[PDB]
């Protein structure tokens, strides 16, 4: 049972997705985090290649929990009555990004350009996985404090890879991309990219460029803050209105702005101890 094998500490957040505590693996204090959900709740369903009948959420997250990665792991799952229970790594310490950037603002360039690699090397691999996540922000990123390691989260508005158009889309409104508020139609790819556009914006300039859909359509970022010549290129090539205009991930991490990254210990050492 879930209530033998780990110890439920304080409980970390609360929402449309579920309730998540912190706790404890008893058999040798490793730290987790264990997630609720309501199977009445539960929006789109899954099944797992034991055949067992379970929500999305699980199976994606088995395909990206192979080896090392920046992907929040699974380490066990329960079925209850009338809910599912999952235990997740839980870092030690850890701030999500939403929050970072909340209480410290616009991150340095050099910063945000060691947490942007991260996030595109978590993303690549959640591809190679068979697996999109469509909601990837600032509070779906984990910023491990110590080892400066950023790690991915919540796959309840992910789904499996395909090279087809979708036709839905439960994440964020003002993470939407245009072809999704005209058409309601997108790729996971190409629109990876407009998230990941929205959210380099977000890190160096402290907040999201779109409030509202027609300055979404509008496709016009204006640079509050001071940013280099070199970012705002690359955030407008990521938010460019055509699909097809967007780079792949290959022609972002090979774009000038993302050279010579800093690896994540020395980014910690200079950026957060
Ligand atoms: C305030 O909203 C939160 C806050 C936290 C999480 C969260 C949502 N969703 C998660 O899947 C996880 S996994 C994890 C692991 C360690 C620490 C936090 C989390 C969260």
């Known amino acids: 049972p879930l ?4 110890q439920v500490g304080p409980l970390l957040g609360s929402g449309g997705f579920g309730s998540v505590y912190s706790g404890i693996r ?3 204090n490793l730290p987790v985090a264990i997630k609720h959900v309501e199977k009445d709740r539960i929006s789109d369903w899954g099944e797992l290649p034991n055949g067992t009948r379970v929500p ?3 199976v994606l997250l088995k395909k990206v929990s192979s080896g090392f990665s920046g992907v929040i792991r699974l380490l066990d799952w329960f079925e209850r009555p009338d809910s599912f229970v999952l235990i997740l790594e839980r870092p030690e310490p850890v ?11 616009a991150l340095q360039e050099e910063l945000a350009r060691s947490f942007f690699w991260q996030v595109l090397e978590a993303v ?10 469509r909601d ?45 508020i005209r058409y309601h139609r997108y790729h996971g790819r190409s629109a990876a990219v407009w998230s ?6 977000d890190m160096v300039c402290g907040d999201i460029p779109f409030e509202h859909d027609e300055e979404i359509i509008r496709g016009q970022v204006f640079f509050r803050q001071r940013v280099s010549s070199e970012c705002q290129h690359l955030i407008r090539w990521c938010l460019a209105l055509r699909p097809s ?7 972002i991490q090979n774009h000038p702005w993302m050279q010579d990254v800093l690896l994540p210990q020395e980014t910690a050492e200079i950026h957060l101890h």
Not at 95 to 105: A, H, K, S, V
Not at 124 to 133: A, K, S, T, Y
Not at 196 to 201: K, R
Request: glycine share 8%; net charge negative; with cysteine.
């Open 56 to 58: 999305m959420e699980v």
């Open 124 to 133: 690549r691999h959640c591809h190679n996985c068979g697996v999109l996540h």
């Open 26 to 28: 008893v058999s040798d």
């Open 196 to 201: 990941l556009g929205i959210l380099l914006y």
């Open 136 to 180: 990837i922000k600032d509070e779906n990123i984990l910023i491990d404090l110590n080892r400066g390691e950023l790690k991915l989260i919540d796959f309840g508005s992910g789904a499996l890879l395909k090279d087809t158009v979708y036709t839905d889309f439960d994440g964020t409104r003002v993470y939407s991309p245009p072809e999704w």
């Open 245 to 251: 205009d967007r780079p792949t991930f290959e022609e």
């Open 3 to 6: 209530e033998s094998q780990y």
């Open 95 to 105: 701030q999500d990004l939403f929050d970072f950037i909340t209480e410290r603002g």
